[model samples]
Target chain A: NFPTYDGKDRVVSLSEKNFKQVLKKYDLLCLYYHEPVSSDKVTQKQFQLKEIVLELVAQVLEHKAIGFVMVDAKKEAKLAKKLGFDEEGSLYILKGDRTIEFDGEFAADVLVEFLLDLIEDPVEIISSKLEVQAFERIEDYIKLIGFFKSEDSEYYKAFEEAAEHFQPYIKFFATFDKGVAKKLSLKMNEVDFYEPFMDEPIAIPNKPYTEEELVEFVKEHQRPTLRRLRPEEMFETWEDDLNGIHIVAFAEKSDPDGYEFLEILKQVARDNTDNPDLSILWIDPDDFPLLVAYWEKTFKIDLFRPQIGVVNVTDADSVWMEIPDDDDLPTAEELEDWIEDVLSGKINT
Target chain B: EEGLNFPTYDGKDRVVSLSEKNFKQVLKKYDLLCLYYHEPVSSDKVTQKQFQLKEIVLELVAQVLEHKAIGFVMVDAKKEAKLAKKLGFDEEGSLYILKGDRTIEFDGEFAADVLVEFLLDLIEDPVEIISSKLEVQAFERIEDYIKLIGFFKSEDSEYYKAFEEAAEHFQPYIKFFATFDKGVAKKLSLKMNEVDFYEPFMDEPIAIPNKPYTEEELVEFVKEHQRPTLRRLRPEEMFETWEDDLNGIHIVAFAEKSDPDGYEFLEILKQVARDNTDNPDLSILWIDPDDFPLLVAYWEKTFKIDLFRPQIGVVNVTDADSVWMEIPDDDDLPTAEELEDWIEDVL
Candidate 1:
């Protein structure tokens, strides 16, 4: 049988069943549109397509930043038509409700480059609270979130100047809501900069918002987000979780439901951005066996499929509600309540 | 089946035992091939030797597992006669660490630690044998110590054992090194085609008979060579003669005809040498700067010693060119005790 794209396989086969759920997990999803090849008599073109898709699968597995899906256009003709894609052997990149079809020939390197460019380019502007949440959701690029009031013309100008200067290095975003600024505990008529390099959104000190101060702030804090954490950074992420409460989600690409749980963890991390003491981190179970083993041994907890644990920064021997099962998978509201209870020290961990 | 049985770290014979059956295949697969074979002359019991060797090989299990590049195989010299013969290991309880065709045969005593050191040395850089030539030469130059140099015709001969055993016995007290007698002995004026001994402290040398020299004889011979004595300073000797001649501690005093203090200094040195007869590494020589002006000038230029008459100095003949500590002339001519202390300090 031809391999189908599921969350478990390296090359996930997409159907209408898990399409929307899997689509929401990745910032960009590459779909390989092709007709099913018969096992007995596979055409040369189909064989070549299969070969390149296998290569792409390996690349996608290694670069976990991108998601790959193979769609059986013949079986899912309606879904294919809905996306406005009629080509039988074409590739399409799904980015936020938009399907950008690949016009070039099918090659692994060409497609991978296309995927990398989509993730690496463009600076997003943050004007509303929803936009701020969207910016926080992007784990690939470092967000230089600028908070400034619209009435403060000088601050807005400085914020724009900083954004333009740091656009190449970081994803520059500016918020003009005083209420949103109030939520982040920021003053009006003043510019505030926040970066997600640490557990807490580390504020960039740029008092008396001038071009020079803004430039200095951007220069000091602008760095890529989807980079390997140093040993110190890994330790700091554990210890410096927002409000001393950190949630770590462990998953593997081979796990059918792992990516979904990982997405839920990311959402939890983004939603609780205002609570500086609570943090959520996602780690691949296969990539760091030693760290997983250490945690399991220290806390006396067995971590299995799609597991989450609340870890106190100071306590290494205890894990709160150890290895929370996915029986009643935590919603955003439930996660927030749990975080609050954990932070308040009211829950018996 | 016709090879030595090698046990795993857990005493399970899980690893393939090395034999003639799979020798070629194993050799091709491994970067290192260690063949531990037994010979007839081994003093250790067969069981004891086998146990220790098995432990050593088992210790290498970690290394082999950690780095797939290394492999250890043991061969029974008695059972795998053909393989042992082909590898040229006639000695009892021998270790051969090989990589490709090049081999580093362990010459030290069999111990797990020693074998580990050998393995590590081989692993750190496979081409360590090239640098070992310098180490062999350095063993010859033991510095202010009597170097018992053994010249042998071949390692397979009984003479080699006699020389090797003698070297091993006296190794703790004095420096001992051996060389092939063919070309090296001639340079040392040791005109022999057989096994011979040349001690730098002594004027004459000894030759080994058909039998190996007893430990008592080796010890006596060393003691006799170690006795301090006064001799005429002769620097015009051949390079080989000088090599053998400058084997120990030489205190040379440069004196002129009119320098009575230098003459008195030489007499005192002679008396000191007689008293310290047990110290074979110590020797005294009188060189009149007037009689040997060229030699004096050469010594002065080489060691930066101003031969301004009555310069009493000590030279470790092995390190003669580099080290020459002169007794300062400003001090009232040193007593025999003071001279002895100075020599001891330098030694």
Candidate 2:
């Protein structure tokens, strides 16, 4: 749209005109100058975004208080790429040159702003690394990113505070997911890349209780409160002596084939010997083994044995009635004695 | 840079500055006997004013513990006066040794020894310590001077009378100084009547009056009229106020008798042993490539502890008597009885 100096330099002249127009529009007329002769030429140091972004990353890592390592940022980017972040502008967590594809997406500017914010302060960068490491695995990491894009500021705040304490995975998830970090190095002109020592002058107070007196006081008293005797205690009811009572079970399903429901019954019965009811046949689908297995496997329990009875049901209606079975059960007197022993705080172990 | 070595302080080479990691390294170099003081030393250009005092305190502690240097901060009324008061320090002209978190004010004679013993307790292991930060009176003498005049009544017009009493109570100390000053000796020598009477009196403790008078009687009749004149002339009688006067008595007692010929240093070592049953924080070595055998004999006899070997010779001090030295007694964990026992041994 402007006059050309020559055929080859026409493109350069066009770019110069376009650049001058941009400077005029933005009120950056100072940028429209020739170097040495004082015309309009923006130096690479002044306008180059690539150099600025790289310097921003380096500066964020170089801050003495922040003490972030550049390797951490690289590691995060590697992780982002692996998580299929390159798929779409909406899905991929991209920064700088890698962000061109996601330029006009719904939350693109927000995501870019978030990244820039973290890079703005070296502390934020260092904290981001810590946040990411707090997440256990890649799955947790992706979940965190989703939380960020969805504008969950509350979750990000919690993550940010936790990251400040230097929980690596948590910080990583926070910064990368929330995208609040920014690199404002472009707006300014100077940058440095030297790392300095970050000295933490205060040590964390590691005691479980901040007050010694309170802890000692709690250790001394929290035990004795007697309850009133129940109606059964007033009645003094008895069926059997209830002494030497060890094993009792209840509600075992009737097995026509008798295909070793007895073993399952014995296991369940021994497991719940301390139960109040002294019935001796207690194998049901909702019993101790099934519940223990479900809890252990699901929750990653390495060591635990359930000390309570479990019940199984054939269907929802099964709660109304039990599939009956019979075995020698403890006498009422024996049960009473066992209950008395338990009430008296006797430990069988 | 690989083979380059800096000058060594004890065994390890010195560096420009220490970081947390290398600070610990420097501490280990001393084998924990040395004590450290970190000053937020300021000049025109660099300002450490923005640095948190508590942070510096913690950093110093870490450095001390790392290097195994037992750290001690002087807790005195005049210096860190409020801090000393908060820490329950007994303030006087002399340095007070720390007992656990509290302070045990001792006479100048024993103060150094107590500190040394505290330091000795950290021997064989590198010990790091942080001193209790307190603002203290700039000098011990000024504090002593203040305590000397503190005995006088505000209502009394006799400032000279009080000054005379202080001089008398401090006669032994004066005599000790007279050993160095010919003018003081010549002045004392000329007064024959004063000499024979005061000479014998100087060594003995001040005696108490036989009659117990009422406060009014004591202040008006006894203190104002009779006792003040007597004490002004007879320096030995000044010991009357010493019993209840904790730091005041100790200050005059040391300055009067102990500062001459390194007596203060020896006495301090003795006190350290007395307080902690160990070597005091300070030690003396000859400037020459030799040891002071006689002084060592007196020191060991007074404190009953071995000399810290391979001595750090020719330490700097403006005056030997001016040293307000102490040690980190946090390590020895000396019981009260042990301190008393050491005191008995020294005495």
Candidate 3:
């Protein structure tokens, strides 16, 4: 009756009236605002039943670690506006006076991956060659892999201890199958790294790798392939990537075309990781709305659509490519060819 | 097991008696040579300590061999007085790493592993221990190489000291290796005190023979069996292990490789060394000056020769006063006997 609780007690109903006192009781809280299907059909569709069902399962499972609550956006419009919950199905995890909004998609594994990522040792066990390949096809993460003959082996203990120290700072994976072990690693109880663009994985040849060496190896070899453009940690991502010849993709998550271009930009970065010359940046114009006009006047391209191009940041008017149309977001292959052409001096000619 | 009084080698026994005849030869073969000069087994603490020292060696032979190629032997104290005095080891019922140079003197305490403080060093030993049968099988099959491997049932056994002692003296000439494996030893028809000599391309190994392992017997086995008669000497062989084999007395010969005069001079010295083979004290050495410049300078200063041509000399490193026959630059060379006569003049 009340927002599809459906006899599950784990999802609690919250309001502007009782939310403050209720939120205070749980040190970690997962809160979302929803509406009935009639008022906004898109709202119901956006909250996919499958995705919601998966999230509901998370609430049922981890009720103790985190509290789950939902507010009806229509009924508490003032509260929703004040809290800055503009989207209907947006979920936020409040961590003791800190609020972290989920930035990923709505599926269970993606949701769980986001949650577990925030929790502890975010190291994942990779089972097969395909699983590793599949993981390689996603988000920018450090690929630290360890091969262990036995989990209880002290060598593996050293690796796990290394993972705990470098957790969330880098991604770690372990392999046990002898065949896959041969494909990825050398002797058992060894750790290796296949940097974002490397064709071969570099092994840390520490006779018998101690926990300390793994920590030192992970810290030193951490690298970046795709980085976000911002006033913060990002601007320096490409200090030489052509003395700043950036393969820039303008995308914002709020728009579907914007979201789609980011994926193509990501896939393109992974594809050309071996190319030493290509540097990529994903730009969300919303990050600097004041600079949207600056980008338009500078690149002589529209700011509203998904854009892929090369730009030398030093030259304000040197437009290497443009944000031209909505119908064509450079398919990953087209973008790959464009960069090769750009790097080859064909596009400039 | 024989008590301190007797070190006679029975076929199946674990003790090696060091007689005067083989004592010095045995002393040369190890890095750290430990000798417990034995008195009668009176059950007196002093005699008991010698017997106790005997057990420590047997235990080491049975197990660990280290950087200190701890070769242990037992000598009858009454008979060894003159040999001990010559070695400067005056205390009969004590243990010492014998040579004119002695670093460890056995102050008695039989409890625990006392020799680890001595037999095993802070560091330094030779004679690599072959831990597996596979290593032996692989190494034994090596062509164009020579090594002596002692297959002892127990390091605690008496022959190990003789075996290790031989390893010490052989120095840089023959690589001495010891392996402990009961199954491999029996398969090779070895008792406690025997070693298998491996030479390049041998179809089967030949033993050092089931003999009494006096230091002399072990040293003689290597001297006779090693491949090259005119052995090329290295710096370590000359100076570091100088106390043992070469006796600080050398018929040091310097020559260049493939030079006609150098070859002729080497042939002369080789024949001279062979002819005087009966004298264990006669050590003939050949050094290539081309391989060493700074060392050649030291030799030139000492021997007073221009190393440009073949030169021969008898140098006694122990003291001064030696003799040499110089080669005439534009004249004919001396016969091998002429070089032998020069070596004779110094004596």
Candidate 4:
């Protein structure tokens, strides 16, 4: 099913009356106290951008059954002063007995990641097979579980450190009992990572593998098909996708065409999980200004319209496809057909 | 539950007393509908507090004179419980607007002026909610209007509020459109919180360079791209049209009736125009080179090209730079595709 709001508001407007009630109701409640007025042009501009980011962050948290609230500093002056409201805007998370103030980046991704890290333990220790079966099984985030022979195992060390570093981003689970490990027909000292919206769980390498290699595996597998074509990340970002025939979806998030095409590719790829040797490189021309000419020469693509099709990516003797019109944006079936043709060698490289 | 009064119904009214029999037909008649689900039998002071359509319509008399778009419908929920449920009249006494594509839940005060303000805001909203491709197509049929359509998962989607604020600022001048349906999005090939700017004569809509556009950023985008395309190069707008909407460059095609295939050359220039449809920087114009004999002489001297035959080239008025396409000394002229390629080559 598609994600929906359905009139369920993400931001709960807090007053003095409901403020205490909400804190008691939610174990991990985040509060954003912002003044509904501003004068400084720079602050106003920055705040407006963060406003959307905050909305997105709250929406994500609310969807996960977490509580997010906004209190007008002026309207709830009594509560605001009691909560130590000093700035025009402030962020805080009420974690049971402790109140943690956020003094980091004002980004949706950053806030959401930070808040999620607080909701649960970094690595959950599995007590029973029922807990294993009852675990969250969805195509949202990458899930990694460790079936260590003993808690003293060196592989367990790598897993724990990886769990600490990847906290909130990747969901980590651990099991030491042979009985629990054997319940799912898994041997001791074995580790497996389930790449969400991907194929079956991939086995982690032998005990000699470093924690860095394990992290890279998650990092590499976590990304596939639809991805931001980062010009800044010159090494693995562009290289990994270009390794295969990259289906360049020339779109920018701000532009309606690019924005839609990226999502279209995203939604389509997830539906058909057995991805071939094909990847959709979401290339925003504005982001790659200097490289635009390079793409124009190599791919013969027009930055005029947001299009989805194969384009040359540093390969010699490459072939390209036609630029799609406004209404000619690819549907699921059309995207599948084109992808199959490209992979089957009909649309020659 | 008991039936409520339909006092506003008699003697041919703006407020129609609707029943199951004619509800479907009446619902189809009005695009902008203000539906009133009347007082139920087992209600708390229904007569005193319930929003009767008669008074609401009476209060809306001024809105009525200017705009008949917001029509009225009254439904007694007691006898029409199924229909009430069908129409989302979950509450006993409530008002909602069936604005063709969506049902707007009215939650503000039901007093005269405040209620009027809410309805006015709904109809006067600069951003039109596009439910289907046909709506967008209808918008595109008109000329000289530069439109922007934003796609969002919901009104709560990130840039949707930014887009709404941008629309509010640019209201009544530059039209803004939005769509939220998944099917409509797939049909438009758009995704959540993405915006594309459209010009009437453009082959395809131009997307803004930035993503997650702020209100100021989007306002700046609209302020920049909202200029006329495919129009004549008037002396007053020669620099004006090129500066903000486009770069200070003009793809000028000199035309005159004296040539043998004058109409043919005109068609060629038009084809070239159609080909460069998406290029916002392409400030193309067709001028009667002979009309301005000095401008013609200026072109011939400056670009060092003959405007005698069909001449097509790029002129950067800002830099005093010009580049003309090559034509054979014989009668043969460049094709539209060739001219388009050359235009791409130089500019």
Candidate 5:
């Protein structure tokens, strides 16, 4: 659900951390009220003044300066009264331990360097300021990733190209024997309910990406290999509560007998038959040479039916297929020859 | 959890019943602004002086809290039972009272009576105008507090304990004092050889390093350390001189290193103390041990240093007696390696 705002468009009960996030995103024009500890012994005006002073100090520190002038009216009045002068007529300036009492232009020159010495080093402060700025930009990047995953994008095209290599399996799944089809349809219908409005937009902002840009972003931001969960792995309790579409892939090692993980994954696939979007593929490192050689020899993509995408989870890898568009067939030999050359290690040079 | 609720009636059209639910909604609106309680005062000079100030604070806090304002409390009160009473009765001196939005000076004879009457009248109405018209300047960073503690620690353990107890109660006061950006910490750090300013990462991930540094290296490092707020108060912009002489002491023991002879180390330290004392405007004194008497004696004899007599703290590093043990030999000089090894063993 979208967050609701008060009449002033302020989030109610926003903590200081969240409030700062909001401030970083938008220029703060409205008043923010907070109850500090009682021991602070600060009045509301002084509290506001202190915040302004601290912000000013942050700015001065940003400039690599020692200190800044406190625009505290209460402080000014206190100084005026202390020096036995009329508060209405006198101007008070504070610097370090010294306070100067004067009238009009006289006080302007007071506490100049003294205040400057208090707030030195602007670079480090500004660096922290920029860190806060970077966190605000994350939402914009997520939307760009979503666009690349759409059905019409190159990602979908690549998935289609990989599917054609598994031709007989597609035919086998499509036919499903008339008897089994009835049972499967009945089973799927019982568990699945179609909702029209559940398909809402992902709220992330769109960020522009070139090929190089996407590569760099992925390299820097991709989850490390150790953190990715396998298909048969137990999900964290909060996985469904996560705000974004999460994707993970894992590799399986060689075993003399069958892989136990594969058995668990098969069971999960059987239970989640109605959720067709989720896919699982297994590839053996030794079988890849045989499969690639056979697929290449008989590869007539236009003739073969396409289903299910494949990703190499083994050491040796090749991207020999072109992304498919609407049609299930290959257009020309352009993608096949490139893929074969890469697989043969000819493209490395 | 059950005790936390108020009784409320169910949605039946029968006799009204008392239940917890009805009281819950109204409980959130309660606000009590007045939070000050004052102690009585007799004719004792110190007590009278402090009592006058405390009375002023009580009135000011009462007014400020009524208007939901926030600020600091400044008092000239000392905890010595006899001293406080003596100061309270003094008619010659006036006490400064600062709270929330208003600051009032209690003139013991001339203005105290009028102020007390005005305060009494204001309490009845507690009008917003009192806060609206009253303005308060920030408090100065009191050098005396640090100086007192530092001097006391060096002089007597009993006095230091008394100072420590008082200082602990004024931790919040110290925090407010820091916000003023007065060079009080700098002055104290220089004069006393130690400043009680709390660092954000004291016990956390970004802890202070414990490596021994040459006097020059230490001085240069402290100079280069980024002090953003201090840098802004440049001399060209203001009338007052920004003389914050903050001395950061890091007691380090050399486990394995080569250096000038231990005598050279002592000589360098003596030079540092001498140079800091020579500067009339700014000062810094960083001690490797609690050798206060030697340092002070060296400082006084060498540079005619007199101002910081009572303003020095002994930082007990490694072991309790390390300060005493590290005093230079009377006849023979020790090697820096030997000295560091001894220091390391204690640590």
Candidate 6:
């Protein structure tokens, strides 16, 4: 039996009997193929195989977005052969109607990168009316939604160029129908970047849309998805998910004012969900004393109640932005504008 | 076992209260152990004596924290009478600094600063210069070299710089030492005051009329008394008799005749020797590997160490110090600045 990814053994093991039922229940399934029995108790190759599967399991737990299963090829040979597992050890990632066989080397970093790339939004062309289902599918991604007059239009060519340049990081789509523009409240020939977290749409400046300007505009407005970071989830999440401009709002549960400030941050995070340029997180000062000490020593800043700090993880520049005054507590829209200004380098503090 | 009732300072206990159980363990850990106790022979009440001892211990908190090498252990003289008597604590309100089998009692007034100074003085281990008539005759008379003697009343005298500066300047070549002017002169049947200077048989003893004489003048006087000799390897027999010659620095270069820059490198070092004429402290020696085969063999055989060909090493022979550095090969010989940097670092 293989160990679980989360160290808690939360993932269930699948046998030949429960395989079909488990497949029907999950939209995505990951199968770990291993030799059923060996003359020697354990070999170095088997140890490496177990390490790779454990890493993948950790990634699954990190996203909480994947269904994982491990299968013994020797014991369940009939089921494994049916799913195209002809070798002793292999990995198969199965989603809705597609199966991806990982042919890369058995390295954890490479395998994790391959898995992340597999789950990201793939490039697609939109025509006539934009489907709600298509947008919903990639709602978690930073979407560069383009409105073009026609397939032969200059705007469409520029949008295509921008899409090809940012395909690896940003998801791009274009619609030619005027009704699609009306549905999204976008003017015809106008390009807009849609973010899931932000309530407002980021419109491209009214000018000649060059590939350079399009890439720059998208890069400047890209914001990371905001998630509440706990003390335990700090190191991995900061390095992997929020390795950008991270703005942390520290609050205490006992303080009503802190709760109010956190509510304001939640609304702002919702308003700019599609921007991958920034990530907003919150921590309770009372729960994590060591983190508070680390912040105080590392950043040389004191943690007060209802304090907000902006840290650029890629750079060494960080600042405590504000502790809201009693009479001038900011609203969600106001905070959203402030965050945008800070991200755009307009506000130094 | 209940020990001394040492008062707490700023809500923190300043002294470690010693008991019969932990006495041996605590003593082994600290380099210097200070035991404060009230002896049974005191006229004062027990409570009053304990209070005074606690006050003295409390004042030591800052000094104890600054010098982590020392530990303060307090004992109740009456409670641990056997241990206290074993440690020779016969007086009340007293302190003793213990180091292994040695004990130094505090004889000064019962004050915190006085005791702190006493401990600091005990900790300082200064290098002393031996200047007996036999040592001087062995070096100056037999070896035919100049002697730079610094005469001072004590270590704290301002005029001691004459001895110290000259010692630093001529450490590698001449014999540099400090002697109590009156005591050493009296032993040698010469008349001199506490701050008089002398180089016996070479120059007459003179007193510094102006309390603190200039270091330049004193250094010049030593240079004027120096005996000149060829700038090459002194015979191996004479090297052993040279006392305090390695007190500062010795840059010894072992070279081969086949090496192209071997002799040319010696010329550059001679230039350094010429430039530092007044600085008697530095000495540069060159040993031809071809001439000293037996010496090299003996060194290797004795210490079980290897010596590479055409190597330059700095040795401070006073402390048996050997230089450990990457000496550049012949193709990449160091510039004068690089050589100076290496010497400065080792010094």
Tell me how each candidate scores on DockQ against the true complex.
0.00, 0.00, 0.00, 0.01, 0.01, 0.00
Best first by lDDT, ranked: 4, 3, 6, 1, 5, 2
Worst 10 residues of 3 chain B by lDDT: B1-10
Best by TM-score: 4
Please tell me what DockQ candidate 1 reaches.
0.00
Taking the tens digit of each residue's C-alpha lDDT, what string does model 6 give over A1-349? 1122344553444698898788886555778676664566456455444644555444443433556677777778888888887744456777555566544334333344445444543434443221433453453356766777777888778777777554334567777767666777667767777665455567889744877888788877654555555332244345543446667767653333455566567677776665767677666655443234345555555444467767767654677665546225566777777777777777653
The CA root-mean-square deviation of candidate 3, after full C-alpha superposition on the true structure, stands at 34.4
Instruction: Report the number of the highest-DockQ candidate.
Output: 4
Which regions of candidate 5 fall more than 4 Å away from where they truly are? A1-349, B1-30, B33-39, B69-199, B202-312, B315-347
Candidate 4 residue-wise lDDT, B1-347, digit = tens: 00011011123446655688887777776556766777643445754433443455433432332233456667777777778788778754356677655566554334333344345445556676766454555555544356788888787876888898888665434668888888777776676677888765555777777677888999898877664445444322233344433456677777653222343466566566667665666656766543343244345667787655567777776766877777744136677787777777766
The digit string of per-residue lDDT tens for model 1 on A181-299 reads 66665565454454453345656564556778767866654432212222212432343355555565565432324544555555665665555455456656443432443555555
- Return whichever of 2 and 4 wins on DockQ: 4
Better of 1 and 3 by lDDT: 3
What are the runs in model 6 whose C-alpha is more than 4 Å off? A1-142, A148-161, A164-171, A194-199, A205-213, A223-247, A251-259, A262-306, A310-349, B1-347
Q: Which residue segments of model 1 deviate by more than 4 Å?
A: A1-141, A145-232, A239-245, A322-328, B1-347
Q: Once superposed on the true structure, which residue ranges of model 3 sit more than 4 Å away at CA?
A: A1-113, A128-140, A197-199, A226-247, A250-278, A282-306, A309-349, B1-347
Which consecutive 10 residues in model 4 chain B have the weakest lDDT in total?
Answer: B1-10
Which window of 10 residues has the lowest lDDT sum in candidate 1 chain B? B125-134
- Per-chain TM-score (chain B), model 1: 0.33
Between candidates 2 and 3, the one scoring higher on lDDT is: 3
The residue-by-residue lDDT of candidate 2 on B68-146, one tens digit each, is 3443332223434444444454434333333222233333212121223223222311111111111011111111111
Model 6's DockQ? 0.00
In the range B1-347, model 6's lDDT, one tens digit per residue, is 00011112344454756787888888877777878775433556865654655565445543433334677877778888888878777765556678556565554334343354345435432223334443333323312234444455667766665556545454333444456656565654433223344432223344535435566766676666453321334332134323325456556666543223454454444445445544555555655544343244343333233433345666665664566446555435565666666766655
Query: On residues B1-347, what C-alpha lDDT tens digit does candidate 3 reach at each position?
Result: 10111122223333366778986687677765667666646767765755665565454442333223556677666766777677666655566655334344554432223344223321234465554444445445443245667777666767677677666664434566666777766666666556777643334566766565677887787667653334565432333223333555666677754333465566566567667655655655677664343344345566777665677776676674356676766125677687778777755
Off by over 4 Å in 4: A1-43, A46-114, A117-119, A150-154, A183-185, A208-210, A226-277, A280-337, A340-349, B1-347
**lDDT tens digits by residue: candidate 5, B91-182:** 22343332223223333222222232323222221211001000011111121111111222232344333333333332211221111112
Q: Each model's C-alpha lDDT?
A: 0.52, 0.25, 0.57, 0.60, 0.26, 0.54
Query: Could you arrange the candidates by TM-score from highest to lowest?
Result: 4, 3, 6, 1, 5, 2
Model 2 residue B340 CA deviation (Å) reads: 41
State each model's C-alpha RMSD to the native. 33.5, 34.5, 34.4, 30.7, 32.2, 35.4
